[PDB]
Structures are given as structure tokens and as C-alpha cells.
Design an enzyme around this catalytic site. Structure first.
Site, PDB file in Angstrom:
ATOM      1  N   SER B 148       0.847  -1.180   0.000  1.00 30.09           N
ATOM      2  CA  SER B 148       0.000   0.000   0.000  1.00 30.09           C
ATOM      3  C   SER B 148       0.884   1.231   0.000  1.00 30.09           C
ATOM      4  O   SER B 148       1.977   1.218   0.571  1.00 30.09           O
ATOM      5  CB  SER B 148      -0.909   0.014   1.238  1.00 30.09           C
ATOM      6  N   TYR B 162      -2.282   0.381   9.920  1.00 25.86           N
ATOM      7  CA  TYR B 162      -2.255  -0.044   8.522  1.00 25.86           C
ATOM      8  C   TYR B 162      -0.976   0.351   7.769  1.00 25.86           C
ATOM      9  O   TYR B 162      -0.280  -0.510   7.227  1.00 25.86           O
ATOM     10  CB  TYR B 162      -3.504   0.480   7.793  1.00 25.86           C
TER      11      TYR B 162
HETATM   12  N1  LIG Z   1      -8.465  -0.993  -1.729  1.00 19.67           N
HETATM   13  C1  LIG Z   1      -7.416  -0.221  -1.701  1.00 19.67           C
HETATM   14  O1  LIG Z   1      -7.453   0.928  -2.086  1.00 19.67           O
HETATM   15  C2  LIG Z   1      -6.070  -0.627  -1.230  1.00 19.67           C
HETATM   16  C3  LIG Z   1      -4.871   0.175  -1.170  1.00 19.67           C
HETATM   17  C4  LIG Z   1      -3.637  -0.289  -0.678  1.00 19.67           C
HETATM   18  C5  LIG Z   1      -3.560  -1.605  -0.216  1.00 19.67           C
HETATM   19  N2  LIG Z   1      -4.679  -2.428  -0.247  1.00 19.67           N
HETATM   20  C6  LIG Z   1      -4.478  -3.872   0.120  1.00 19.67           C
HETATM   21  O2  LIG Z   1      -4.785  -4.726  -0.972  1.00 19.67           O
HETATM   22  C7  LIG Z   1      -5.389  -5.934  -0.537  1.00 19.67           C
HETATM   23  C8  LIG Z   1      -6.738  -6.051  -1.267  1.00 19.67           C
HETATM   24  O3  LIG Z   1      -7.870  -6.038  -0.433  1.00 19.67           O
HETATM   25  P1  LIG Z   1      -9.169  -5.155  -0.826  1.00 19.67           P
HETATM   26  O4  LIG Z   1      -9.506  -4.322   0.351  1.00 19.67           O
HETATM   27  O5  LIG Z   1      -8.970  -4.444  -2.119  1.00 19.67           O
HETATM   28  O6  LIG Z   1     -10.338  -6.226  -1.115  1.00 19.67           O
HETATM   29  P2  LIG Z   1     -11.435  -6.795  -0.065  1.00 19.67           P
HETATM   30  O7  LIG Z   1     -12.793  -6.528  -0.593  1.00 19.67           O
HETATM   31  O8  LIG Z   1     -11.322  -6.249   1.303  1.00 19.67           O
HETATM   32  O9  LIG Z   1     -11.104  -8.388  -0.052  1.00 19.67           O
HETATM   33  C9  LIG Z   1      -9.857  -8.894   0.417  1.00 19.67           C
HETATM   34  C10 LIG Z   1      -9.707 -10.429   0.349  1.00 19.67           C
HETATM   35  O10 LIG Z   1      -9.009 -10.872   1.516  1.00 19.67           O
HETATM   36  C11 LIG Z   1      -9.614 -12.072   2.029  1.00 19.67           C
HETATM   37  N3  LIG Z   1      -9.301 -12.355   3.462  1.00 19.67           N
HETATM   38  C12 LIG Z   1      -9.493 -11.543   4.569  1.00 19.67           C
HETATM   39  N4  LIG Z   1      -9.056 -12.190   5.678  1.00 19.67           N
HETATM   40  C13 LIG Z   1      -8.582 -13.400   5.307  1.00 19.67           C
HETATM   41  C14 LIG Z   1      -8.009 -14.476   6.029  1.00 19.67           C
HETATM   42  N5  LIG Z   1      -7.861 -14.399   7.356  1.00 19.67           N
HETATM   43  N6  LIG Z   1      -7.593 -15.645   5.346  1.00 19.67           N
HETATM   44  C15 LIG Z   1      -7.745 -15.748   3.951  1.00 19.67           C
HETATM   45  N7  LIG Z   1      -8.320 -14.671   3.242  1.00 19.67           N
HETATM   46  C16 LIG Z   1      -8.725 -13.521   3.905  1.00 19.67           C
HETATM   47  C17 LIG Z   1     -11.082 -11.881   1.714  1.00 19.67           C
HETATM   48  O11 LIG Z   1     -11.857 -13.070   1.793  1.00 19.67           O
HETATM   49  P3  LIG Z   1     -13.269 -13.119   2.581  1.00 19.67           P
HETATM   50  O12 LIG Z   1     -14.329 -12.439   1.702  1.00 19.67           O
HETATM   51  O13 LIG Z   1     -13.665 -14.558   2.801  1.00 19.67           O
HETATM   52  O14 LIG Z   1     -13.174 -12.414   3.937  1.00 19.67           O
HETATM   53  C18 LIG Z   1     -11.011 -11.218   0.332  1.00 19.67           C
HETATM   54  O15 LIG Z   1     -11.032 -12.152  -0.737  1.00 19.67           O
HETATM   55  C19 LIG Z   1      -5.464  -5.853   0.998  1.00 19.67           C
HETATM   56  O16 LIG Z   1      -4.364  -6.576   1.523  1.00 19.67           O
HETATM   57  C20 LIG Z   1      -5.317  -4.385   1.305  1.00 19.67           C
HETATM   58  O17 LIG Z   1      -4.747  -4.127   2.568  1.00 19.67           O
HETATM   59  C21 LIG Z   1      -5.910  -1.953  -0.742  1.00 19.67           C
END
Ligand SMILES: NC(=O)c1ccc[n+]([C@@H]2O[C@H](COP(=O)([O-])OP(=O)(O)OC[C@H]3O[C@@H](n4cnc5c(N)ncnc54)[C@H](OP(=O)(O)O)[C@@H]3O)[C@@H](O)[C@H]2O)c1
Lengths: 248, 256
Positions: B148, B162
Site C-alpha cells: 500500500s 495499517y
Molecule cells: N483498496 C485499496 O485501495 C487498497 C490500497 C492499498 C492496499 N490495499 C491492500 O490490498 C489488498 C486487497 O484487499 P481489498 O480491500 O482491495 O479487497 P477486499 O474486498 O477487502 O477483499 C480482500 C480479500 O481478503 C480475504 N481475506 C481476509 N481475511 C482473510 C483471512 N484471514 N484468510 C484468507 N483470506 C482472507 C477476503 O476473503 P473473505 O471475503 O472470505 O473475507 C477477500 O477475498 C489488501 O491486503 C489491502 O490491505 C488496498
């Protein structure tokens, strides 16, 4: 001491101040003129350290268990009975199977946050335009150099701490609270006492360091003193290696 | 798919691939010709995703809870009966915790550090045998971790755990890159800014919140799914083959 480096009339707290790097820093700050409170996990050893450091200035031990959110409020409470303000906070309390990762992340990052969070009131009691309150976090070159060895929890935890320090710096800068990181390389500590005692193992380990030696305690003292004073008044969010060129 | 970007014959695993960025990446790799497994906690949602993604190639769900060491071990065992090697590991599963600075959170921190950092280490640790069975001089095995820009930029949102947790992830990735380089296993980080997901949907549905959030980004907009897909593909292929230890923002210029 000369006004550039003088800490007369300043009140300081050094967490993990009972041994090693924290104790090196506490002695320096005392030698600079500061009143220095110290805390560590072991209250008896910490009070013994404070007594010994009393040969250098006004040093007092405070009971604290920083490995909890209750522990951080207790330290803030205990300090607040002893002082109306805090000018200098030095966060050194740290540690080094993935079962051990939770603990490494707790002490090196989360506990430093909690400690800072609970001390914000008295830090704000001190903070001014003329002389900002100072938060100095002890990090590590392990959080920056890719040349790790083993201990895959340690390096990343220090990087988390460096980044936490940068974020805090940015948020707190307008309140006149400066946040900086000292990022040490290898320094003498009871953990590596066996290496320090044996000249063959000492030089063998120093071959990974471009300067070919470990850091000296007076080098840590000197840097901490200047960061807490005039040299550090105009810096915030810095991460400064003191590491023999290891980071290169 | 042109030879430069084709992942035909390659076997991929995307953790957290049931929704969000994981899902965008999973679809991207599938369209590149890769055989891609996905995993998440929600068994049904993950299976539904895999079925939906089956429109793009061979997609299969492996339910797994990465929030403990035992879960990473089971995932490695489950994939092991399904495949003899692993060419592409994408570590996407992660979480945020947002609350006031001076309030309470400490359990939030512990959960954030476990998923964003510790669980990623164990994940790679447990999967290294499959990675090594893939790895060669002519084509290295690939590890792609989702970091991130919060781990890079000082600009504080909420979520004080975070940013630091993502910084720990980036450093871990760099250390692992240095150690495994001679074994032909590359490790690189994609450091995103704002992308649409479950975590951000409340901002996206409020016109005023979305405006103010978009204004904080130099490009004045959120990332598009196709942009994440393209980068993940590039990284997994020829563009990423001479790369290791990289942390690459895809953030609309937020890092600056
Ligand atoms: N969105 C952004 O702008 C942004 C920016 C920087 C970094 N990130 C990072 O990028 C990644 C993407 O996540 P997101 O927020 O975009 O999508 P999200 O909608 O929050 O989904 C994230 C995925 O993580 C899985 N997960 C959560 N806990 C888990 C566990 N204990 N064991 C196995 N799987 C697990 C979820 O499965 P379930 O549905 O079963 O819970 C889901 O498929 C994250 O690591 C986040 O920190 C995101």
C-alpha cells in the site's frame, strides 16, 4: 555544557532505559543536563540502573510494563505524579517459528504507539514554538537494509516503526512535537555479549560492517543528545542510520 | 495474448482473490492464459467468484483462513494435491483498522500486523517447496505481494496500524527478494493507492465523500480494475522477470 548541546531544565523519559542502547542514551541526556526518568520491564534492575546513573545527574526509575495498553496508561499516570510535563521521550523498548512474530510486532511497533498516545497530554504541556517537545524512536538498519540474515520478524517490525514515526511526525508537527528515528547498526548489548568478549568472533562479525567495527556507546550518547537539542529542533520524520555504512 | 504478456501454461495462486483487488488480479491473470487458484475465508463467496471468473479460464477456489499459521499450512497442502508446482504467488489478503488516535485500539493493531505481515511470511514459507519446483534460470518463480502507498507516504488517514503494517510487508519482501534471488524466485510489491473494494464502498456511494477523497489524489480519481490487472500481469511475466525487490506504486501520484 555549551547551549547547542545543553539539556539543562529539560525533562526526559527513556523507555527500555535500564540496559544497552537505552542506558547509553539516558547517561548522555543526564550528562547534557536533563532530568531523566527511565523505565523497563524489570522494575528492580531499572531502579538499580537509575541509582547507578545518579552519578551523572537526576535519574529516576518508574515502574512500567509497556507490552499492554494498560501499561502505557500506567506509565503516563505514574509520570504525571512526578512531573507536570515531558520534554523528551525516547522509545527504545524493543525485542528481536512464526509464533514469536506477534510479540516482536507488539513491542517494536504497537507498544511504541500506545506509549506515545498516552503521553501526548504532558508532551503537549511542554510543546512550544520556541522549543518543541521531542519524540525519539530507536529503530534499526535492519528495517532498511535488504541484507537481513535470519530473524525475519525483526527487520519488518523496525520498518513498521520507522513508518509509524514518519506518520506521527506529519500529524504532530503543527502542535510543536517533533518525531525522529535513530536507526542503529551493531552496538554492544548483553544479547551479543559472547561475540564482544571473544576477539576472533568479534572481528569475524565486524567483517559485514564496512567500517569493520561495532558502534561505541559514546557515539549513541552523542547522537541522542544532539537530536534532543538544538541540532534536532528543526527536524521531524527523519530516520538516521548510525551503522558503520551497513545501509549502503 | 502476445508472448511478452502471456502467462499460458503458468500456475497462479491469488490469496484474498474472492473480491476486491484480489479478484481484479485473478481475472487479469486468467485472461493472460494462467491457470489460477483463489482463496478466501468465505467458502461460498470464493466458489461463486471462481465460477464467475471461469468465463476467463481455469479458475478454482481453495477455501483457507490465513489468520493463523495452521491455515497457511493447510492451503499449501490443499494446493499440493491439486498441482505439482506453483509459478505465480500473489499475496493479497489484508485488512485495515481505523479509529481516533487517542482512543482505545490495540486489538486492531494485532489483527492488522498478523494478516498484513506475519500471514504473508508464513504463506510464502509454506509454499516455497511448490515455488522451488517451478523455479528455473529461463523463467523464475514469481511472488507478488500487495502492499500500500499508506506504507510509503507520511500523509495520515485514520488506520494508524495499517501504514506501518504495509511498510513491514515492503521490507519483508525486500529481504526475501535478496535471500531467494539465487534460487530463481523473484519477489516484488505492488503498492496501490485508492481502488474500489468492500472497505471503501461507503465513500464511493456518497458523492461528497468521494469528491473529497478523489481531491486528495494528484490524478483526481480512484484506480481502475483494468489498471491493477495490467500491472499484475506485467509483473508476473516478461516485464517482471529481471525484477526483484521492487516496490511499485499504482496510486495516482499519491507517493509524491
Ligand atoms: N483498496 C485499496 O485501495 C487498497 C490500497 C492499498 C492496499 N490495499 C491492500 O490490498 C489488498 C486487497 O484487499 P481489498 O480491500 O482491495 O479487497 P477486499 O474486498 O477487502 O477483499 C480482500 C480479500 O481478503 C480475504 N481475506 C481476509 N481475511 C482473510 C483471512 N484471514 N484468510 C484468507 N483470506 C482472507 C477476503 O476473503 P473473505 O471475503 O472470505 O473475507 C477477500 O477475498 C489488501 O491486503 C489491502 O490491505 C488496498
Amino acid at each position: 555544557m555549551h547551549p547547542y548541546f545543553s539539556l539543562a531544565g529539560r525533562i526526559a523519559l527513556v523507555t527500555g532505559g535500564s540496559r544497552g542502547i537505552g542506558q547509553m542514551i539516558a547517561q548522555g541526556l543526564l550528562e547534557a543536563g536533563a532530568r531523566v526518568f527511565i523505565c523497563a520491564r524489570d522494575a528492580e534492575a531499572c531502579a538499580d540502573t537509575a541509582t547507578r546513573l545518579s552519578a551523572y545527574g537526576d535519574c529516576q526509575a518508574i515502574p512500567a510494563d509497556l507490552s499492554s495498553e494498560a501499561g502505557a496508561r500506567r506509565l503516563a499516570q505514574a509520570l504525571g505524579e512526578l512531573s507536570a510535563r515531558l520534554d523528551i521521550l525516547v522509545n527504545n523498548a524493543g525485542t528481536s517459528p512464526v509464533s514469536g512474530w506477534e510479540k516482536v510486532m507488539q513491542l517494536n511497533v504497537t507498544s511504541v504507539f500506545s506509549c506515545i498516545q498516552q503521553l501526548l497530554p504532558l508532551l503537549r504541556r511542554s510543546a512550544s514554538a520556541e522549543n518543541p517537545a521531542r519524540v525519539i524512536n530507536i529503530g534499526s538498519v535492519a528495517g532498511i537494509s535488504a541484507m537481513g540474515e535470519q530473524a525475519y520478524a525483526y527487520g519488518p517490525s523496525k520498518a513498521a516503526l520507522h513508518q509509524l514515526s514518519r506518520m506521527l511526525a506529519k500529524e504532530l508537527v503543527g502542535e510543536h512535537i517533533n518525531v525522529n528515528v535513530i536507526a542503529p547498526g551493531r552496538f554492544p548489548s548483553r544479547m551479543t555479549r559472547h561475540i564482544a568478549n571473544d576477539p576472533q568472533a568479534l572481528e569475524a562479525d565486524s567483517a559485514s560492517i564496512p567500517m569493520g567495527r561495532w558502534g561505541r556507546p559514546e557515539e549513541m550518547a552523542a547522537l541522542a543528545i544532539s537530536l534532543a537539542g538544538t541540532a534536532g529542533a528543526y527536524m521531524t520524520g527523519n530516520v538516521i542510520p548510525i551503522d558503520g555504512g551497513f545501509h549502503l
